[PDB]
Structure formats: C-alpha cells, structure tokens
Design a protein around this ligand. Structure first.
Ligand SMILES: *[C@@H]1O[C@H](CO[C@H]2O[C@@H](C)[C@@H](O)[C@@H](O)[C@@H]2O)[C@@H](O[C@@H]2O[C@H](CO)[C@@H](O[C@@H]3O[C@H](CO[C@H]4O[C@H](CO)[C@@H](O)[C@H](O)[C@@H]4O[C@@H]4O[C@H](CO)[C@@H](O[C@@H]5O[C@H](CO)[C@H](O)[C@H](O)[C@H]5O)[C@H](O)[C@H]4NC(C)=O)[C@@H](O)[C@H](O[C@H]4O[C@H](CO)[C@@H](O)[C@H](O)[C@@H]4O[C@@H]4O[C@H](CO)[C@@H](O[C@@H]5O[C@H](CO)[C@H](O)[C@H](O)[C@H]5O)[C@H](O)[C@H]4NC(C)=O)[C@@H]3O)[C@H](O)[C@H]2NC(C)=O)[C@H](O)[C@H]1NC(C)=O
Lengths: 34, 207
C-alpha cells in the first residue's frame, strides 16, 4: 500500500483542529487522490 | 421465520485507507413461500442508503440465504458509531434488528516482539519465526509477514487471547526453510492496530 496516503489518513483522523464534516472531507480527498 | 447475523469489517479494512470496510447483514432460512427480504440500515440511528444486496443463493436445505453489504467510513467505525441492520420479511411477526459497533474502552498500544527459533528446532528443515504482540485493546488487529519487500505467506496467527490485565495478546508463527534463516535473510512482522501511530508498525527478525 502507499504509506504516504496511510500517513495522511492517520494525521487527518487525529487532527484536533477539525470537526466531523471537515475530517470526513479531508479523509475522502486523501482516499480518492491517492 | 428467517434468522439474521450481522458481521463487522475485518480489522485491517478499517485501519488502512487503501481498504474499504464493510458490515454484512446475513439472512438465512428465508422461505420459497415468502422470499421478499427488505433491508434498512442506520448509522447511530440515521438511515443510510448505500447498502447493496448480493445475488441470493438457495441452500442445500431449500431456503434462501440473502446478504446485504454496507460499506462504511473507516473513521465512523473507529469512532464507535453503531450500525443497525433492519430485516423485514413476511414470515416474521416483526422486523429483526441487529446492531454492531467497535468494542468500547480506551485503546491500548500493542507491543511487538520478534523471537528467533529455539536452537532445539535446528534439527528440522523448517524453523519457526515468532511474533508476539501483547498489551493491545480492542482485540481487533491484523498481523502479516514479509521479506525483502515481498509477502511471506507461510504463516499462521493465533486468535487474540484475553490477558490478566484486560488487554489482549497473540502470537504469529512464520515457517521458513531453515536455510533461508541461516543465510541471514531478514524477515518482518507487520502489525496494524488502531492504537499504533499510522495504524502500522514493523519489527524485523534475522540471524
Ligand atoms: C439452512 O442451511 C443454511 C446454510 O448452511 C450452510 O452451512 C453448512 C454447515 C450446511 O448447513 C449447509 O446447508 C450450508 O453450506 C443454514 O445457515 C446457517 O445458519 C446458522 C444458524 O442456524 C448460522 O450460524 C451462525 O453462524 C455465525 C458465524 O457465521 C460465520 O461463520 C460460519 C462458519 O464459520 C460461516 O458459514 C458463515 O457464513 C459466517 O461466515 C462469515 O460471514 C461473514 C459475512 O459474509 C464474513 O464477514 C464479512 O467478510 C467479508 C469478506 O468475505 C468482508 O471482510 C466483510 O467486511 C465481513 O463482514 C466472515 O468473514 C465470515 N467468517 C467466517 C469464519 O467464514 C455464528 O457467529 C453464530 O453464532 C451465534 O449464534 C448461535 C445461535 O444461532 C449461538 O449458538 C452462538 O453462541 C452465537 O451466539 C451469539 O453469541 C454472542 C456472544 O458471543 C451474542 O452477542 C453478545 O452479546 C453480549 C451481551 O451479553 C455482548 O454484547 C457480546 O459483545 C456479544 O457478542 C449473540 O447475541 C449471539 N447470537 C445469537 C443469534 O444468539 C451462528 O452460529 C450460519 O452462519 C448459517 N450458515 C451460513 C453459511 O450462512 C441454516 O441454519 C439452515 N436452516 C435450517 C433450518 O437447517
């Protein structure tokens, strides 16, 4: 698997500066473009 | 009439963004007489509509087995959302509702330890490479092995075992030709768990 993508996923999942909608948005973008 | 069994995603599927975790609602004992099976799905009580029913298949005992698969977001499962599968059929006094979600409790980080074969095992042509993973919670975890960057597949992993402190442990045993080990080849035990940074860690083992 692409570790870069996994790192970004984990970072967005735990970023305390995001609310549920933004977390979901960021994870989805990470999911589709890599 | 029919019975319902609700299954969670595989631990690896909710941890790796490359995977697509699914929850599966299985209905058995659906009769020829009353074959209509309706599914309703809710996440924390809010109905969802991305569920897809797979082709049903009649069983050796002359009943229908019907399955609805619901893809879920990795974050929702990990963050404890409740998945409810509602099954409606005419042979039921009422719809059957089954609910599932990740186990509750603070997650605990797995400690990963690789152990070489016992000298006593060198009399054989195959040796055992051991990966002990302990102190983790929830019990949901995935373990794999590789070498040189490729997947060593001749391994078996024990189911998680509840330890005396409420965490879990397990052992994964990779079996390889003794020569490969004696030649200095490096092997790696990969562990994926919610309580690990990046949900991933690797520990090497070599002579
Ligand atoms: C007719 O016919 C049919 C068919 O059959 C078949 O088989 C064979 C043998 C023969 O028979 C032939 O015919 C054919 O072939 C039938 O059906 C059946 O039915 C039954 C009933 O009766 C059922 O059973 C059940 O099972 C389960 C399990 O399952 C699983 O496994 C198996 C084996 O192993 C298989 O087979 C199946 O299929 C399954 O599998 C699975 O699947 C899933 C889904 O698909 C999957 O997942 C998925 O995957 C994918 C991939 O692929 C992805 O990953 C996704 O994501 C996912 O999701 C998986 O993987 C798989 N796995 C494997 C391993 O394979 C079980 O579980 C159950 O059990 C239960 O119940 C019972 C009763 O009934 C009991 O006894 C037991 O004990 C249990 O119980 C339970 O318990 C619990 C506890 O533990 C509880 O809960 C709890 O609570 C508590 C409180 O206190 C807490 O909370 C906790 O936490 C919890 O947990 C509960 O409640 C309970 N439950 C109840 C209900 O009660 C059962 O056993 C089966 O399944 C079927 N089969 C099929 C095939 O389907 C019928 O029956 C007939 N009929 C007549 C009339 O005869």
């Amino acid at each position: 698997f692409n570790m870069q993508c996994q790192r970004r996923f984990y970072e967005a999942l735990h970023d305390p500066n995001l609310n549920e909608e933004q977390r979901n948005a960021k994870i989805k973008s990470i999911r589709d473009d890599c | 009439g029919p019975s319902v069994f609700l299954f969670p995603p595989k631990p690896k599927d909710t941890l790796m963004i490359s995977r697509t975790p699914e929850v599966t609602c299985v209905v058995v004992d659906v009769s020829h007489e009353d074959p209509e099976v309706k599914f309703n799905w809710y996440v924390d009580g809010v109905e969802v509509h991305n569920a897809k029913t797979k082709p049903r298949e009649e069983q050796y005992n002359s009943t229908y087995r019907v399955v609805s698969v619901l893809t879920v977001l990795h974050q929702d499962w990990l963050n404890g959302k409740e998945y409810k599968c509602k099954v409606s059929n005419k042979a039921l006094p009422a719809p059957i509702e089954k609910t599932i979600s990740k186990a509750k409790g603070q997650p605990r980080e797995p400690q990963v330890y690789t152990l070489p074969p016992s000298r006593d095992e060198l009399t054989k042509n195959q040796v055992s490479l051991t990966c002990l993973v302990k102190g983790f919670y929830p019990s949901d975890i995935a373990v794999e092995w590789e070498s040189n960057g490729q997947p060593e597949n001749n391994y078996k992993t024990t189911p998680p075992v509840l330890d005396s402190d409420g965490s879990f442990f397990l052992y994964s045993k990779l079996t390889v030709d003794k020569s490969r080990w004696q030649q200095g080849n490096v092997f790696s035990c990969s562990v994926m768990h919610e309580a690990l940074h990046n949900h991933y860690t690797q520990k090497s083992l070599s002579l």
